[PDB]
Write a protein that binds this ligand. Structure first.
Ligand SMILES: CO[P@](=O)(c1cc(C)cc(CCC#N)c1)c1c(C(N)=O)[nH]c2ccc(Cl)cc12
Lengths: 396, 550
């Protein structure tokens, strides 16, 4: 076993278990009994003060329950251990994502580090004490697992990689991201070949080139009111904090004077010249915005109504590395949860790391309902924005 | 009686060594009494004699219970490792299931009947001093879990889980709940077949060295527990006594509020807002607060509710839970949870966020999330809600509102007061209506604000304001605009702050200036509100900015 150490001074995680539903506690006991019989996890006494949370989910289009340990806190306190991502992956035609988490259960975890992987299955109404368990094997959702396993993963793919030097294979958490510039049927056949290579060591589609900016579109009216210009100036005003070439000096001259909101205002030759100048700068990208690997990625999401969501990834505010949309029933949390996962999925494919979400929702509502629609093996960092932005209008 | 369990390995906190505290000198009366006890404890096998080689020492005292020994483990507890939370919560009676027969087994000598880890025993060393510190004192160490040691409650509770694991596996029909020393055992077997299974468990407890009260038990139903009364087919809180006073101190009001809150989990419609308002400000614990006419009226309504004793029923796993919420006013909400119409499992209440500006539709949602979480903890599932809000009213809110918001399966129930939005801001600017451009400025040093407007129809006003801020002036300007406008009106501010407040449709606020603007918004037929960036030569905003800048 590879020996593992925490950051100097940092103690292990002591995070409270979020209360679970009846079906999930029952599903987790079914699972945790079989993992105990197969040696992957052992019961633990009260000498272990550490605890990580745990819930049950269902992986994309499946009925069987799957365990999901929330190792975010342990990941934060281990990162001296683990912490390259191939820049080519985002320029592939097709990228397929394969869950290789079952590979980790074969490798044993360092006996001394096992204490930190403790987790509790809570009982309903606390009638019984919580069923405690710690990991004997490399756990799924701990960032130490792929790092330790990397030497073994390179060995498994060494044939397949020599076989196909165009295929870009990348690994984040329990997933494997396999990209190619091939035809989709040809690509699928290479993915099926890859599954077979993995089968011999115990192991049973997105299009990054087609991701393009959702630019800050300006309106096009037959005639303009004062209000329509007042809103149009604000959109450009706010856009000029990001975009270098934005100006609106000729536009604001049209408003000079205390006019009513519904009064119609004809545009000058310079106004429509300045307006078109803005459009085409906003359709094309942002100058001087580059990814710094030392600093965090952040994601803000805005609700637009009618199943529509907009988002922006960045490191330093008003300097967007990526913008986008998410569309399509009457559940808000579900859609936000489906959005959060989609954005993270992209972020992992572009930079090899997840963003800190600024979620527009009350902490309690999300905390309650997020696991009922969550399907990923990973979980990103989130905070909750309870401040009502004007940004809803700017990205419409 | 000790016990043959496997010991829990214990360590000190990394880096730290055990306690080396000096033994303070004691009177001859205390020394004598301690020797008598530690001999008894030694014979029963709880402690053991040691030499002077052991370098650790924790002090000891003696008090009048009859003498009762007392070890102060404060220093050992610091140096002892952290342990796992003994309880993530206590069970609520409403989550319990109805049982035929119920018995309470008290373990009694709980901590003293479980072995302490061999390697840790040395650290539990203490000394009985000699007469005025002449000779070397007698030295002992614990072979069992001491009273008041950090890891006793955790280690004891794990031993019980282990001890029961065979019996629970062998007897899946009966149910044993663990709380501290007690074991509460319940079953749906006959009074004959139950009493037999009790004695099997009592014998099983003795098999691993745990004593327990005989068929002549200490208690029988109904039981008093954590401030509850637990009958076999129902539950309730323990007798509430709201005192009669000429004059109320703070201390009396705190205990009153506490008892009323305690009652609220079965007595429906308890209110405590007007009583709580009095506690705001300081005053001492013995400082008398004269009750307001509201608090007197509120306390009177609680006496009325408490007159007739109400009881809660237990959970049926097969049947659905039905939560059902009402509005009491002043942002006070009450709810009831039942399974068969109006046979409540429990009740409760929700109180408004004492802070920020809000409305009824927001509050009702916050009250749903409170009640939802309560149900996940108590019953493991979300109840089906019956709310006083039209599906058309909720649809209008969630679609438009900026936050993501969701509430599970629910139905309308026509119980006034019903939840509604008291106004709506216009989607598009109103034709044939005045356009009040507004702004507020405020000096940072002198705190002297000006607030005012300029309109499309010529008009102007500029009110001076003392001891204020930029925010309060920009709200004051929006208030001014509403005052001097008709039933329709358009308003152009540069304050994202005020847009953010007013777009979220508050019908209630702490800031009194916001309550005035709300009052205006409700009177009007139509209001439109738009935002522009400040200092951009935008007409109307540029004019009013300079009026207030002086
Ligand atoms: C058999 O006892 P329980 O485990 C129980 C649970 C708790 C949290 C407290 C008590 C306290 C008893 C005393 N004193 C009993 C129990 C349960 C249960 N856990 O299903 N159901 C009951 C119905 C009536 C009564 Cl009096 C007790 C129970």
């Amino acid at each position: 076993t590879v020996p593992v150490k925490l950051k100097p001074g940092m103690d292990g995680p002591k995070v409270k278990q979020w209360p679970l539903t009846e079906e999930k506690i029952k599903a987790l006991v079914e699972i945790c009994t079989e993992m105990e019989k197969e040696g992957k996890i052992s019961k633990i006494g009260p000498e272990n003060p550490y605890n990580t949370p745990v819930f049950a989910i269902k992986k994309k289009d499946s009925t069987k329950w799957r365990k999901l340990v929330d190792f975010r806190e342990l990941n934060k306190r281990t990162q001296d251990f683990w912490e390259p991502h191939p820049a080519g992956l985002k320029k592939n035609k097709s990228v397929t994502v394969l869950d290789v988490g079952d590979a980790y259960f074969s490798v044993p975890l360092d006996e001394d580090f096992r204490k930190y992987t403790a987790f509790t299955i809570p009982s309903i109404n606390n009638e019984t004490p919580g069923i405690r368990y710690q990991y004997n094997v490399l756990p799924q959702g701990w960032k130490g697992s792929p790092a330790i396993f990397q030497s073994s993963m390179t060995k498994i793919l060494e044939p397949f990689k020599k076989q196909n030097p165009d295929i870009v294979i990348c690994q984040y958490m329990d997933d494997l991201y396999v990209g190619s510039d091939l035809e989709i049927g040809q690509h699928r056949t290479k993915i099926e070949e890859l599954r077979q290579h993995l089968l011999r060591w115990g192991l049973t589609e997105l299009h990054p080139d087609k991701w393009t900016v959702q630019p800050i579109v300006l309106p096009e009216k037959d005639s303009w009111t004062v209000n329509d210009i007042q809103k149009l100036v604000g959109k450009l005003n706010w856009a000029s904090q990001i975009y270098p070439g934005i100006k609106v000096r000729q536009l604001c001259k049209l408003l000079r004077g205390t006019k009513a909101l519904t009064e119609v205002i004809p545009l000058t030759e310079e106004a429509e010249l300045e307006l078109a100048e803005n459009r085409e700068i906003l359709k094309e990208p942002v100058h001087g915005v580059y990814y710094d690997p030392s600093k965090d990625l952040i994601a803000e999401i805005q609700k637009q109504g009618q199943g529509q969501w907009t988002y922006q990834i960045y490191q330093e505010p008003f300097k967007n590395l990526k913008t986008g949309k998410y569309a399509r029933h009457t559940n808000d949390v579900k859609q936000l949860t489906e959005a959060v996962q989609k954005i993270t999925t992209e972020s992992i494919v572009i930079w090899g790391k997840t963003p800190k979400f600024k979620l527009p929702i009350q902490k309690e509502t999300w905390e309650t309902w997020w696991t009922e629609y969550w399907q990923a093996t990973w979980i990103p960092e989130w905070e909750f924005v309870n401040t009502p932005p004007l940004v809803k209008l700017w990205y419409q | 009686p000790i016990s043959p369990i496997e010991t829990v390995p214990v360590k000190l906190k990394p880096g730290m060594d055990g306690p080396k505290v000096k033994q303070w000198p004691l009177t001859e009366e205390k020394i004598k009494a301690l020797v008598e006890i530690c001999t008894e404890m030694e014979k029963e096998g709880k402690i053991s004699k040691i030499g002077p080689e052991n370098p650790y020492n924790t002090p000891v005292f003696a008090i009048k219970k009859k003498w009762r020994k007392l070890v102060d483990f404060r220093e050992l507890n610091k140096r002892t490792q952290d342990f796992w939370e003994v309880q993530l919560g206590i069970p609520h009676p409403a989550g319990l299931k109805k049982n035929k027969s119920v018995t309470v087994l008290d373990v009694g000598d709980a901590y003293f009947s479980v072995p302490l880890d061999e390697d840790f025993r040395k650290y539990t060393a203490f000394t009985i001093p000699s007469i005025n510190n002449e000779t070397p004192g007698i030295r002992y160490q614990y072979n069992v879990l001491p009273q008041g040691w950090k890891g006793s409650p955790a280690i004891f509770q794990s031993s019980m889980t282990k001890i029961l694991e065979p019996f629970k596996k062998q007897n899946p029909d009966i149910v044993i709940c663990q709380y501290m020393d007690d074991l509460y055992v319940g079953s749906d077997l006959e009074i004959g077949q139950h009493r037999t299974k009790i004695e099997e468990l009592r014998q099983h407890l003795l098999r691993w060295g745990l004593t327990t009260p005989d068929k002549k038990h200490q208690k029988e139903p109904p039981f008093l527990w954590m401030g509850y009364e637990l009958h076999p087919d129902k539950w309730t809180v323990q007798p509430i006594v709201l005192p009669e006073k000429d004059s109320w101190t703070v201390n009396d009001i705190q205990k009153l509020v506490g008892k009323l809150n305690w009652a609220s989990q079965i007595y429906p419609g308890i209110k405590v807002r007007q009583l709580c308002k009095l506690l705001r400000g300081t005053k001492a614990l013995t400082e008398v607060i004269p009750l307001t006419e509201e608090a007197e009226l509120e306390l009177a309504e609680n006496r009325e509710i408490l007159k007739e004793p109400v009881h809660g029923v237990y959970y049926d796993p097969s049947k659905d839970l039905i939560a059902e919420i009402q509005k009491q006013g002043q942002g006070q909400w009450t709810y009831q949870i039942y399974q068969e119409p109006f046979k409540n499992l429990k009740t409760g209440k929700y109180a408004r966020m004492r802070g920020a500006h809000t409305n009824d539709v927001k509050q009702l949602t916050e009250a749903v999330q409170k009640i939802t979480t309560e149900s996940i903890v108590i019953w493991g599932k979300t109840p089906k809600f019956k709310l006083p809000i039209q599906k058309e009213t909720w649809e209008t809110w969630w679609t438009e509102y900026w936050q993501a918001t969701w509430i599970p399966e629910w139905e309308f129930v026509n119980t006034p007061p019903l939840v509604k939005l008291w106004y709506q801001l216009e989607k598009e600017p109103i034709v044939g209506a005045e356009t009040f451009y507004v702004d507020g400025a405020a000096n940072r040093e002198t705190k002297l604000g000006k607030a005012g407007y300029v309109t499309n129809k010529g008009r102007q006003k500029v009110v001076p304001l003392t001891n204020t801020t930029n925010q309060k002036t920009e709200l004051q300007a929006i208030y001014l605009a509403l005052q001097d406008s008709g039933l329709e009106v358009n308003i152009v501010t540069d304050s994202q702050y005020a847009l953010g407040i007013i777009q979220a449709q508050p019908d209630k606020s702490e800031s009194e200036l916001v309550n005035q603007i709300i009052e205006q918004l409700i009177k009007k037929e139509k209001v439109y509100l738009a935002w522009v960036p400040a200092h951009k030569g935008i007409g109307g905003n540029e004019q009013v900015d300079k009026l207030v800048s002086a």
